[PDB]
Each structure stands twice: as C-alpha cells, then as structure tokens.
Amino acid sequence: DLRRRLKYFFMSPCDKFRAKGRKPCKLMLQVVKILVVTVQLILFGLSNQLAVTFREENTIAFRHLFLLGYSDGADDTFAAYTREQLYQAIFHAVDQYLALPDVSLGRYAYVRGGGDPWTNGSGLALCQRYYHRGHVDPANDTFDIDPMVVTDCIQVDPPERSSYKNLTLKFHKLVNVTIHFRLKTINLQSLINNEIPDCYTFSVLITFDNKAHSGRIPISLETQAHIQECKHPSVFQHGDNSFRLLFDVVVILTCSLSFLLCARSLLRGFLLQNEFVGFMWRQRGRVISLWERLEFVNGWYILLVTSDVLTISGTIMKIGIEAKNLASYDVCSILLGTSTLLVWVGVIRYLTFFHNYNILIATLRVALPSVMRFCCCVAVIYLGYCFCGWIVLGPYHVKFRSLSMVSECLFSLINGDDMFVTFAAMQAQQGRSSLVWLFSQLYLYSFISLFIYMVLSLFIALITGAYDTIKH
Amino acid sequence: DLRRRLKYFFMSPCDKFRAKGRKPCKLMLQVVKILVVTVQLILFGLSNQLAVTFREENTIAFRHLFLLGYSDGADDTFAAYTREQLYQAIFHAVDQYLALPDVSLGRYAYVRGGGDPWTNGSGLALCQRYYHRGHVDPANDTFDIDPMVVTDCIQVDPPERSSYKNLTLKFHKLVNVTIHFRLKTINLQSLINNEIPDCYTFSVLITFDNKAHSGRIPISLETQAHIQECKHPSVFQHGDNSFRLLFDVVVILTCSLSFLLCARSLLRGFLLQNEFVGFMWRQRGRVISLWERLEFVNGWYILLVTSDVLTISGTIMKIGIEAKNLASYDVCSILLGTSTLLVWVGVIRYLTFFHNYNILIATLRVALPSVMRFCCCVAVIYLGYCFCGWIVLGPYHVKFRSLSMVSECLFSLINGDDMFVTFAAMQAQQGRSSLVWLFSQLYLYSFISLFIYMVLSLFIALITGAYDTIKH
Amino acid sequence: DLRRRLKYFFMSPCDKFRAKGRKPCKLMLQVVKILVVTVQLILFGLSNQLAVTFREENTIAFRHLFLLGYSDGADDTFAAYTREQLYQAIFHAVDQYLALPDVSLGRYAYVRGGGDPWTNGSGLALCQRYYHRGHVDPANDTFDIDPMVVTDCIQVDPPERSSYKNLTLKFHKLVNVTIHFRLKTINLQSLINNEIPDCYTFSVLITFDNKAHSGRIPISLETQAHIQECKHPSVFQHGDNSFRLLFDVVVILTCSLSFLLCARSLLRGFLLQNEFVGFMWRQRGRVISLWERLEFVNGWYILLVTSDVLTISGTIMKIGIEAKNLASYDVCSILLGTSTLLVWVGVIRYLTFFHNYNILIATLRVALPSVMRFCCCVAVIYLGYCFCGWIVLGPYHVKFRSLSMVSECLFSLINGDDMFVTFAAMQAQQGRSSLVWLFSQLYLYSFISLFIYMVLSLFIALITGAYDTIKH
Amino acid sequence: DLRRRLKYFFMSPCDKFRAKGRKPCKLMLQVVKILVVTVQLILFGLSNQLAVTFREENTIAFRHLFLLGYSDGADDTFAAYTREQLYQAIFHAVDQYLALPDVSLGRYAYVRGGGDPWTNGSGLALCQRYYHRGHVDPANDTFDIDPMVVTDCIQVDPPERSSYKNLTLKFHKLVNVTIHFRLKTINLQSLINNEIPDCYTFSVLITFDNKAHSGRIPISLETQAHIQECKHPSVFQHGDNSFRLLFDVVVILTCSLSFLLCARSLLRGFLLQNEFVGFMWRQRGRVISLWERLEFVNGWYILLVTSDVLTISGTIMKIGIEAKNLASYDVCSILLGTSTLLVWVGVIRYLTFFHNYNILIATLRVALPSVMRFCCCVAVIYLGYCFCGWIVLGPYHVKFRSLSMVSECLFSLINGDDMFVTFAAMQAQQGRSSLVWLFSQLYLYSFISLFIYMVLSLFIALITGAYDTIKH
Numbered sequence A, B, C, D: 001d002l003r004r005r006l007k008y009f010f011m012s013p014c015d016k017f018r019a020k021g022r023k024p025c026k027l028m029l030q031v032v033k034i035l036v037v038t039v040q041l042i043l044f045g046l047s048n049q050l051a052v053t054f055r056e057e058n059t060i061a062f063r064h065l066f067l068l069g070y071s072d073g074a075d076d077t078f079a080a081y082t083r084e085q086l087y088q089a090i091f092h093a094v095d096q097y098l099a100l101p102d103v104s105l106g107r108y109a110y111v112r113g114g115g116d117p118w119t120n121g122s123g124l125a126l127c128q129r130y131y132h133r134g135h136v137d138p139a140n141d142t143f144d145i146d147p148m149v150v151t152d153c154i155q156v157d158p159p160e161r162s163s164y165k166n167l168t169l170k171f172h173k174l175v176n177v178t179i180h181f182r183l184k185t186i187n188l189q190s191l192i193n194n195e196i197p198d199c200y201t202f203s204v205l206i207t208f209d210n211k212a213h214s215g216r217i218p219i220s221l222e223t224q225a226h227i228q229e230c231k232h233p234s235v236f237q238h239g240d241n242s243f244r245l246l247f248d249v250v251v252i253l254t255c256s257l258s259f260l261l262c263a264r265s266l267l268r269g270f271l272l273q274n275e276f277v278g279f280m281w282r283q284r285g286r287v288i289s290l291w292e293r294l295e296f297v298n299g300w301y302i303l304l305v306t307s308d309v310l311t312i313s314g315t316i317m318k319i320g321i322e323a324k325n326l327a328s329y330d331v332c333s334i335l336l337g338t339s340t341l342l343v344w345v346g347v348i349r350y351l352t353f354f355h356n357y358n359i360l361i362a363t364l365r366v367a368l369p370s371v372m373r374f375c376c377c378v379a380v381i382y383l384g385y386c387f388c389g390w391i392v393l394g395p396y397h398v399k400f401r402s403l404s405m406v407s408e409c410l411f412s413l414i415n416g417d418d419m420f421v422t423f424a425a426m427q428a429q430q431g432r433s434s435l436v437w438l439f440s441q442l443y444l445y446s447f448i449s450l451f452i453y454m455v456l457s458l459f460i461a462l463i464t465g466a467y468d469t470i471k472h
C-alpha cells in the first residue's frame, strides 16, 4: 500500500530512474543554478575590486597631499605634541586645499556650500569644538567643569580659475578640530569596461582629536565616496546595457524555479509524514514522543531553499546598486557570498550518492555530536582563561586590551602563531613587574600546554573512533 | 544502617531530589556566585583599562617632549655615542622642562621640592654619579680604581606664570646621569563615569645609563603615577557612590555564604569517613595503607573554597584601592583573575552529571597520569637541550641569552613558530663560525624532529588509548 | 608453459638473479643516471646563482642612481603626489643618465640608437602617452572622451669622453611617462670560472604610471639583461671548453640508453599481456571488463621514461643556452628540476624490495584513494569559503583581493600561520563596519575550527586505518 | 653455576640491593656528577654572557662612530653608489679615528705599529687593492685583463695628548678598500666580579668591498677582541682565585672517577660475555651469527663514558681559557654543552627502573626503527623537492638561493611557518613570469599537502601502533 510510496520517496535518484519516472531534472537544474550563481558572483566581484582600488588610491593621494609630514605606513601613531605643530598641520591642510589645482596630479573640482557645515558659497569648513565653561587647574586641585560642547567654525571659500590664519584654538578646553570639504573626480580608469561615467564626489574629513586630554593629539584623514552618473551616457553603453541586467534576471528566474520545486518537494514530504502518523495510529504500536517524525524531512532542501532566498534577495539589491540610487555594498556582498557558500556546500549531496564518499561523509556526521559536547566543555574553560588573561595582562600588553583581542590571541596560540612574539612582549616588563611576569609565564605555559597536548588530541581521538565505528 | 547514609551521600543531585530533601539550593547559589563574580571582574577591568590608556598616552607625550631626536618605535636602541650628543640630550630635557607651559598640549603643574632629590624650592634635579677615585688608563695597563659612588647634583627651580649649562660631566668616571621631576595633571577623560576628580602626579625619571662603560649610553624615560582626589567631589557622585560598594559587599556576602556551606559539607564528609573506618574496624577486613580514605573527599568543594577565599581577599583589596590609599593593582588583579578562572572551571562539575559529557571528562581524568609521567621524561630531555643551547648559541644570537628566553624559543619551536627566523638568524654567522653554524644546524634539526615527530605523537597515542579504554 | 615466463616476469630482481639471468645491469645504470643528473643540475645551478646576483646588484645600483629619494625597501609605495615632484623625478633621472660616467661606481657604456624608441644617434628616449581628445570636467559632470593613445617622445643623446627641460606633461590627459635607455657592462666577477667574457647590455625602463587617474603616480624601474660574448675568448677557456659539453653529452647518452631499455621492457610487458588475454580466451573463464589487464603494466618504467625525456629535452636547451643564442632559462630550469625530482622519487622503487620499507610504502598506497575522495569533498567546501571570503572581505582587506590570495591565506590559516595578523587586520575596521567585523569573526572562527578540528583529524584517521589494515 | 652470576648481572639496582651487595654508590656518584656538571656550566655561561655584551656594545659604538650615515638596523643594505659617497665615507672614518679622544664617550688608547699592515709609528692603515693591468671597455667589447692584485696602502699616525686627503681610488680596477686600526679599552664593568683587569684590544676592520663590480659597494665594520691582564692584579682577587680552579679540579676528579667505574663495569660485562660464548660452545646449541652477543652490552655506560670524556676535555680547555693564553671559546662551549646534554639525558636510565615510566620509554624504543626507515623514504622525496625548488625558484626569490636555505624554508613549511610570507613573495612576480608563478603555486601546494596530510599522519600512526603493541 504505502510501502511502494515510501520506497519511491526514500529511493536514491538512480534507483528512482530505474524504477519509475523520468530523468534527474531537478538535479541538473541545481547544477546550472550553481553555475549561474558562481558566474554572477565573479562578475560582481571584479567590478567591486576595480572601484575599491580607485577609492583607496585617491585616499592615499589625499593623505600625502593634506597631512603635513606624512609618510607611508605610520597611519596610526601620527599625532601632534606641540601647539605650533598643531597650528602648522591645520594651516598646511588649508593651504593645500587652496593650492590643489596648481599642484595636484589628479583633476578635482570644488563643491560650493550645500550642506550642514558648509554655509552658502564656502567649500571648506574648519570647526573647533570646546566646552562652554572650563577652569581646569591641576594646581590647587580645582576644575569647575560643565560639559556642553560649543562649536565655533570658520568657512573658507575657494577661488576660481586670510581669516583662517587668525585662528585661536583654546587648548585647555578643546575637544577636537575638524576640516570638511568635498572634491569631484571622474573615474577615467573605467575605459576598459567603457562604463566611464563614474563621476565621484569625495567627502574628506580631517580630524584633530583631543578626547583623552593627554597632550597627544592624533591626526586622521577619512573619506567617503558618492558615485553618480556624469551626464554623458550611451557612448559605448549600447552593447553592455543588456548583458548585466539580463544575467541578473536569469539568476532571479532560475532561483525562483528552484525555490518552487523545493517547496513542492517539502510539501510532499509533509503529506507523506502525516499519512504515516495516521496509519501508525491505525495499528497503534511503536510510538514515542516522536522525534523521528522530524527525521522524515530532507535537510538538503532546507539548505537549497535558504540559498535561493539569499541569492534572489541579494540579486535584487545588486540590480538596485549597479544602476539606481542603492549605495549599500556590504549587505549585498554578504548575501551573495553566503548564498554562493551554501550553493557550493550543496554538492556534498551529489557526493553522498556513492558508497565511498558516503563513508567519508557519514564519519563526520557521526562524529559531530561528541565534537559539539567537547566544544561546550572547552568553551567554558577557554572563557575562564580569556577573562583572567584580559584582567591581568590588559594594563601591560596591547594584545590583551579587548576581550575580542584576547580571544583572537588565544585562538592563535592554540594553533601555533605569534607565540614567541607574545612571550617576548611579556619578557619586556620583567623589571617593571616581576610578579606579573611570573604570572604571565605560568598563564601562557599552562594554557598552551593544556590546549595543545590534551584537547586537540581528544578531537583526533573522537574523529578516529567515529571512523572506526563507520568502517565496522 | 550506614548503607542509606552513604547512598544519600554519594547520590547525584537529581537522585538526591528524587529520594529525599529539597531542591538544589547550593547549586543555584553557585550559579548566582558565578554571575556576580564575572560581573564584578568586568566592571573592574573596564575602569582599569580606561586609566591605563591615560597613563600610557601621557608617557608617550613625555617621551616625545623631553627626549631629543625621539621617534615612535626605537624605544630600545635609543642611545648616545658622543659627548656633544649627551650634552645636547641633557640640555634639551632641561630646556623643555622649563618651557613646558608655553609649548605643551596638555595642562601640567610644577611640584616644588618635597622629597629626597629635590631640595626646598626646586622642581627638577639633575644628578650625576661617578667614582670617588678612578685613574683608568688603557695604555700602560693601569686602572687604580676604588668603587664608591659619589653623587653631585644640580637643582633647577621653575619660574611662575643658567647654572645647569655649566655642567661638566666627568666622562671617564661616570656611572649614570638622572633627571627627576614631577608634574600634576587632571584626568578630564573621566567625564563618562563623571568620576572626574582623578588628579594625578607623574614622577618622571630620565636615565642616562653608563654601567657597561662601552661608549654607548642608552637613554630612557620611565614614569610613575600617583592617583588622588582633586578636592572637588560629589558633583555627580551622588548616584554612583552606592553602586560599586554595594556590589562589592554583595560579592563578599555571597562568597562567604558559599564558603560556609562548603565547609559544612566537608565536615560532613570527614565525619562520615571516620564513621566508615570505625565500622570497618568492627568487621576488620579489607584494610590497606588506606589511600582511599582520602578518596572519600570531594575535590569540587576544595576548588570552590579556594575560589571564594581568593574572591573575598581580592574584593577587600579592590574596595581599598578604588577609594582609599591602597595602590597595588597587580596583586588585586591576580587574585580576582585567578578566582574567576576557578569559578568558571567549576562548571565542569555541572557537566559531569550527564552521561556523555561525563565520558568526555573521564577520558581526560584517566589519561592525566600517563601524561604527567611522560612530562617528567620530556622535562629532563628538554632541560638538557635548554642548557646546551644556552651555553653554545648564547654568544652569537640574542634569542639564546637567558635561560628563560631559550626555554620560550624552544617551546615555540616545538609548536611551529619563528622557526625559519631562528634558522636565518643562525645562517647569518656561517662566515664568522662555520663550526657553530654546523652545530646549530644539527641542534635545531635534531630537537625539532625529536620533539614534533616522536613526543606529540605519543601524547596523541596516550589520549587515544584512554578514550578507547573509556568507550569499552 | 607460460607459468615460468610470468614467474620470471613478476620475480623481484634478487629472485631473478637467483633463478636465471645476469646481474642488475639496468638497476646500476639507473643509479649512475641518478648520479649524473644530480651533478649536472648542481653545476647548472651554481652558475645561474652567480649570474642572478650580478643582475640583481646592478638593478639595485640603477634604482639608487636614477630614482630620486629612493631608499632600500619601499619598492612598492614609491610614488609621486605633486606636479613638481613628478617633474623633479623625471629631470633627476635624465640628469643622472647624462652624469653617469663621472659619478657611477661601475663602468657602463652608452648605446646609440638602434631600435624602435631610440632614433639615430640617441641613447635615451623619454616618451609621454596621452589621449587624443579629453575634456574631463568634474564640475558640470562632463567628460567628452575618446581613448586613442598618442605618443609624444623626446630623444636625448649622450656626450663623449637642454630640450628636455622644456617638457610640458599634460597632466589631465596623461596615461604614463616612460624613460628608455641601455647600458653595456662587463662581468668582471667571472674571474673565478675565468669565463670572463660575459658582456651584458641592460635595458632600463623607468615607468611613471597613471592608469588609475587617482592623483598618485607610482614610479618603477625594471631592467632586462642580454648576455653576449665580449670579443676576447680563449684566454683561459682551453681547459673549460670541453668539460661542460662533454658532461652534457654524457647525460644525453645515459638518458637515451635508459629510455631505450625501459621501452624494450614496456614492449615485453605488452606482449606478455596480449599472450595472457589469448590464453585466457582459450579456457574462456574469469573475464570481466578487464581493468586489471592495465594492472599488468609497470608504473616505475613510465616514471623513468618521463624522467629521461624531460632530462634530455632540458639538456638540449641547456647546451643551447650556455653557448648559443638561446636565452630562456625558465623553461630549461623547470624541465631540469622536474626531471631531478622524478629521478629522486624513483628510489622508492629500490626501497620496495625489502619487507619493512614495503610495508611503509604499501600503507600510503592503500590510503591514497580515501585521501583523494575526502579531498574532493573538502575541495568543494573550501571553494565555497574562498568565494564568500573574497566577495565579502575584499573591499576592506588587501589579503582578500584576489582569489589566489584568499586561497593562499586560507591554506595558510588551516596550517597555523598569519592567523593573529589576519584577526588584527580585521579588528582594524570595527568602527568602520561593525557588521563586516562581526561577519569576519564568524567567518574566520568557523572556517579555522571546521578545518583544523574535523578535517585534519579525519586525514589522520584514514592513514591510521590504512596502517592497521596493512599490519594485519 | 653461571646462573646466579648472570642473575646478579642483569638484576636491577633494587633487586641487587635485596639479594647481595651494598648501596647504590655508583648511582649517587652519577647524581652528584650531574649536579657539579650543571653548576659548572652555569658559572661559565654567566661570565661568557657578561663579556659578550661588552664586546657587542663596543662594536655598536664603533659602527655609529665610524660609519657615515649609519642608523640602527640596516646592517645589511648599507652601501655606496657614488664616487663622492665613497670618498666621504672613507674620509669620515679617518677623521673620526683622528678625533676619537675629543668626541668618544668611552676611553680608548691608540696602538702604534706592531704588525703587518701597520709600519713603525702608524696606528691606522688604509689600503686599496686593484689589478696590475686592466683595460675594461664595455664599448668595443674589450677588456684585456690579468688578475694580479696590487696593494697600495697609506699609513696615518695619531697625535698625542693630510697625506690621506690626496687619495685617488682607481675606480675601474678597484677590488676593495680596507681600514685597519686597534683600540685598547678597559672593562670597568668587571667590578661586580671584582675581576676588573680585563684590558681588551679591539682590532677594527672597515671594508669597502667591490668584488661584484656592480656599481654598489657594501660597507661593513667587523671587530676582534683580544683579552689580557691589565697589569694590576690581586686587589680583590684573594677571595676568588681559589673557587673557580677548585671547582674545575673537583669536576675533573668526579668525571675521572665516573669514567674508571664505568670502564670497570664494561670490562666485567665483556668477561661475562666471553664466558657465556664458551659455555654455549660446551653444549653447542642455539647459535647464529651472534648479533645478540653485542646485545650483552650496556648502552648507558657508553653514554656515561662519552659524557665524562667530553666533560674533562672541555674543563681542561676552560681552565686554559679563563686564566692562560687559550682563546677559543667555541670548541670549549660545544664540548661543555654536549656533555651537559648527555648528562641530563642519562636520567632516563633512572626512570626506566619503574614500570610505568618504563612503558613510556619502551614505546619510543620500539617505534624508533620504523621511524628511521620512514625517514629514509621521506629523505629521498624531500631531497628531490629541495633540488627542484632551488634550481627553479632561486633566480627570483632570495629564500631559495642556497641549498641550506631552501632546506630550512621547506622544513619550516612542513611545520607551519612563514607559509603565507613565502606565498606572497611568490605572488610578487606574477607579472614578471606567469610560468614561474604557476610552477611555484603547484610546487608549494603539492609539497605542503603531501608532507602535512600524509607523512606526519604516518608518524602518528607508527607511534600509536607501537603504543598499542606495548600495552598488550
């Protein structure tokens, strides 16, 4: 009765073909879906790479043009330690902004005031932020402070093809000094794709930051690009307009077809399951809390459904980005990359049809639960070690400041990396604190030994036991 | 008779609940103790982090302000090789100290003489130490020396809102030159916590050190902070005065309750044990030297007692530190971190109640003795290698100077780290000493091979044998 | 009948010697072939090393002489950011070319015009490439561009024992600026071999590259040597003319003899096989699709034949290179190195004659298929991870730009290398993109854990199972 | 008969004590020998360390004083690229030598002429070496060269408490330029030991090396110390004269006693063996080629004899060094370190008396032969890979120049070190040679995979099989 139905439902594709029904249509559909998803991802990645290089090189040029005394490397630890140093840095930034068209190797254009910092007609705004009242006096031990940041800002307007040299900076109340301006470029490098009308607008922010009030003011330069269409389309675009959008709609249609087929199959499985519980109610025998009624389901279809949902949701956003006003590449790239990862993991299913590959897969499937329980135990011990190391070695070593950093350092240590650099960093404070040095010796030796000579060996033992159980 | 008593004593908590007695009160007490200890540690660590950053940034500013020709990095290998170089360094330090209020980006205050080096009214003291009699003469081979360090010191007093330029430095008898001064700051960064009255006093020591008499005088700058209350309290402190001290007394009370409960339980175990030895004296049978009468004890209660002792002893010192005159963070942080590590290791006990986690724990408990015996053997071989490597490769390579450094280098080598850097450091003296180069080749190859291909494999074999014994 | 024939065919060499036939002639021929191939490779490698050092040192001297502001290291990140910077770099290059004979520490000679860039009488040609029409205007959003690179070039002729200072560089249309010149040297270092008439001609190309149009123009110096005979032979060459060519013809003859013997043996095996299929047709029994009729063959003879083909094909090209007009060392070195690798792998055959070494070899031969199937599964998962990591972490981290680079980074990570450097590189953008930072944490932890604690353990399990099957 | 004798000969020390004979005299003698050898090694190492630091710091001071434009680091890649650069370097060296007493921070003394380069009265000799006849002409392709190095040298005599500025350097025939001078110092740092009369004499050699004739002349500074007694002894030496020599003679006597006891024991074993072969000749039974007659011997006594021979031979040389004219620390340190390594390995013998440690030792003793046979096979494959990698990647990457360097790089790669740095170094020439880049990809991936996933797994399998055989 239901015997033949469940037989066919649990048959492999080859035995299905042998018994009844036509060829592996869904299987070759999934093959072509793998192909189109990978090709789409590669096409997206090449263009993103070629635009990221342009953005980075323009930022490097901006740093070398506007930061005084800047040299490659040293992007951190670039600061000011003297009032004249800070004044010279600020005045150099503003003078280079005013001299840009005569000295720069690129071609930029000024942007007149159209936002919050820039008033009408101004292209650069240097704004300083201080406290409304501050009477810091390290002598007599009195400060008399009320934090309410006041902003006093100057606007500099550029010339066409003074009043900032009178800046007084209020060093004892200063919070930060910032410089805002914008520069329009044209990406001529886009003559390979012939999609040249990439017509950027960089927003440059130079920050002189005085939060810590340490006498050391770090200096930074961050930028933000805003891509557009540079009012000159369809010179070579007649041949490339159709290809990208047609490939995107092909991907969307293939993934929607895959989703509908897998939904049909999952509904079929659900109905067969509910038939089985009823007919087992008929004889009313071997029933338990029924956790295996969930084992009736097919996990590969769940994986496939998730992958096509992610693929179509990311392809919609890619369509929006590459032509329309969508500017959010992070989420789109995360969606597309996760979908491609899942699509490529879904080949393990085509490998479990053959006996030997199925042995190698069943070994891991059998070993996984013990691995996760051991991961619980090791989790708790490793978290204790992370807390102890953070709290003790934080004040002395910069690799142990954040909990994320101490976690990364320990995870690198249990795999053999930066081990002697860590040990030497600890060695560099023996004279400062012999007690902390001795604690660091005990801590590092104990942790590395316990986690390399006793935990990884047990992971190996678990996997080997699983392999032996499978091969017998 | 005693059968039911020992039954209940050795029952698990679930079977205890099933047989007689109320709920796991001690177990949930230990859970809330884990929680409060971890939260206290995190609260302490955040504030220590935020103060250590301030101290470090002020020290960096001091180095860049007072050391002549100083650049980031190069904190070692910063020295002087010429008399005019040393004179210019000293005079630059003193001139920057005198010019600080006009040039510094921070706000500091001078400290008039109140200690040993500083006489009345002086803020800076540059003191040179030489020998009482020294007639070093490399020619004729005569030195005629009697070491008795004499200190000749100058005091410079600062001005308010000369006599050191006449320094003669006695280069052939010099031991060191030092510069001592103090600077008062106010930690305005403490406006997040609103606990702003952190009103430091840095003690800066600039050392020109001539111990080796090599013609190379290294120059260093060390500082020491002395936190205080800056005579302006209770502006926002009304809301934060109670929270920290209340949390500390809550931790103290929870840990004292835990300690008393575990002491009750350990006394119970002792009395049951002494009852067992007597009733076994009654029948007078299966008695040996009685090492298992100690196996009657519960190690988890020992761990818990140690952890609460450490926690309360460290919380008392934290209470002393954060408000009173206690300034010793090293011991307090070590105590708190060790207590948190032990408290988080104490969850393994809650995992050994279930069968599968108990298998994973019993495997390690069974494998530990063989691991420690193999560690004895490997100890002796590794110590021989450390001695040989130190004595032979010490004179040529700086990674092999100290016994602690050669031990760290070898422990990193047996785990795959800095291996090629070590080999290349050895390669860099083939022309100097072919014999030492060949010895270093043999030494490094032999050690790494013997310790990677024969010792770690035996650790794996021990753990795998233990796992197989447990699973059968 | 055929029983004795197949007995002798499958006998080992020792049992062959015991039963019938003379000594291991082919085996000792292969031994002397190993010897001569290794000696030839070493002789070739020493001379290539000694010439590569000369080429590299001349290129370093060229960089320090012609690049303005160049310092060791910094071979990348050497660029120009200002019009005057670029002009000064170009003029410094040309002035140093004109001043070379008075300032250089080597001895070079000028090469008058004999090629495409250099017209008659000119030694240096500085050529700039721009667009035929370009109206880039970042303001108003208009570019009006048609890419057709026009080359405007200047020729500078050197003096014997002006007109380039009038260069205008067209910065808004520029593609690149190049400088071409040649310099003749004589390798006097070849007085050890006494093969001194190495009389080079370096072609130096200095590129000022403006592809990205970023405002940052990287500057590079590449060279190309062209070895010759410097019209002064046979001063010491009478003793060294014969040795190299005689050794090369000895290698050729030995490898041809080896090839002919192995071809005889393979034909013998083929004829015995075709006799076996016929006589099995006689009784007409245990026949299948006959995959073992291919197992009749000897793989070691295939390896040997390939190795002698590669050796003779590379020795012909080495003969051509070292005296004649052949200048292609890459292919010759690849051929010779592959042939030497195969010749040294062919000793495993001499080890499989003894029982214990044969056990160690048969273990690997039995474990190889499972290893390759697991490599298929791991291939697909690892490729999914590579695609996801490239697409997501490409825009932010330079180790993830190319697919080859992300593959190398992941392959290094699963073996414990640059792990914490990767983690810290990710940490450096938490403030920029918390979302990408969290994704990178999940990604790296998941990948390293899955590939270290579950895949390598299964490789170990496969090899251990194979060893246990072999030893029983 | 002989049964009781062989019983006692093969008894353990505890069973010997139980059966007949007094206490473990030889065993506690070996314990005190371990102690004295380790203490002697430590005492030697501390003093060698403290003198090596002085030598190194004086060399650093010499480099910073005499090399023009020298900065810490950059000890390689320090060269000259211009005639005026070389002239200025030479003249700066000589001027600093003449100005030393007025500018140096150490105290040095001039050494008048008493050797080969220095004639009478001269302290510094700058000598240039060129060819007797050289007509290098890169144009016309003619060199006309006969190598016969002629030395033209200048002598500069120092003043007391010109003619080198007229140097012409013959740049087209130059081989090298050298500068030789000596400086007497006094090690005042030896006031801790009070063994102050360490009265050195540094021989400084500054080499301007032009072997390659590349236009790049590297510049180096090497020194050589010559310790002496500085004509002022026995000021504090009355208390330290006896201790070192008494400890050295104690070590010599202890090691000679150990050697004589072990020689007695080995002769005893030989005589018992020769008795056994005779009495087995009596019954004339179970005799073979008799490899076990050598198994009659005790390897621990061989190890001990070698260790005491090395210890006494190195202690004689240490006695010679620390007071007499012996100046060869390399051989002495090698002897002492090897003897200490052997003495500390000799504790494994005291561990094999107990059953569990003996199991852990017997596992390794049983696994060693299979390990060595697998090492033969892996040897041959790894040597093939080394040859191929050297010959192919030598011309492009500096880590692959020497066979020793490629061997160190590969041995580091199979253990997970500098793997991504190697891969990136290869990546840096994709544009230069795509073919060599592709070969390097195949080469590195193949090697690392074959050696990590197939060879170390087999080492683990061998050790695990040995452990299982021992535990059953």
Ligand SMILES: COc1ccccc1N1CCN([C@H]2CCCC[C@@H]2NS(=O)(=O)c2ccccc2)CC1
Pocket (backbone or CB within 6 Å): A371, A375, A376, A378, A379, A380, A381, A382, A383, A407, A411, A414, A455, C445, C446, C447, C449, C450, C453, C454
């Ligand atoms: C794909 O997941 C895995 C897949 C296969 C095996 C293990 C994991 N693991 C490791 C990955 N995760 C770690 C992330 C970083 C910190 C939190 C976890 N460290 S841990 O539990 O103290 C730890 C430390 C050493 C060894 C085993 C666990 C936790 C699951």
Ligand SMILES: COc1ccccc1N1CCN([C@H]2CCCC[C@@H]2NS(=O)(=O)c2ccccc2)CC1
Pocket (backbone or CB within 6 Å): A445, A446, A449, A450, A453, A454, B371, B375, B376, B378, B379, B380, B381, B382, B383, B407, B411, B414, B455
């Ligand atoms: C938590 O302790 C452990 C826990 C689990 C396994 C091993 C240890 N070990 C290793 C940690 N300790 C080492 C500290 C540094 C020097 C002294 C010891 N090195 S060793 O005995 O020559 C050595 C060298 C290689 C492998 C095994 C021992 C010694 C106990």
Ligand SMILES: COc1ccccc1N1CCN([C@H]2CCCC[C@@H]2NS(=O)(=O)c2ccccc2)CC1
Pocket (backbone or CB within 6 Å): C371, C375, C376, C378, C379, C380, C381, C382, C383, C407, C411, C414, C455, D445, D446, D447, D449, D450, D453, D454
């Ligand atoms: C000599 O070949 C081998 C010999 C012996 C064992 C394994 C291999 N392998 C590893 C070498 N090859 C890799 C090259 C780089 C990327 C492509 C392959 N990576 S992988 O299949 O995702 C992978 C990742 C981790 C472990 C096992 C496979 C693929 C065959």
Ligand SMILES: COc1ccccc1N1CCN([C@H]2CCCC[C@@H]2NS(=O)(=O)c2ccccc2)CC1
Pocket (backbone or CB within 6 Å): B445, B446, B447, B449, B450, B453, B454, D371, D375, D376, D378, D379, D380, D381, D382, D383, D407, D411, D414, D455
């Ligand atoms: C104490 O000796 C050992 C002790 C215990 C195990 C192994 C060795 N080995 C390794 C040490 N020696 C190596 C020196 C460098 C080059 C020559 C040899 N490399 S290898 O035979 O290709 C090779 C490569 C990978 C794994 C195993 C052998 C060769 C004996």
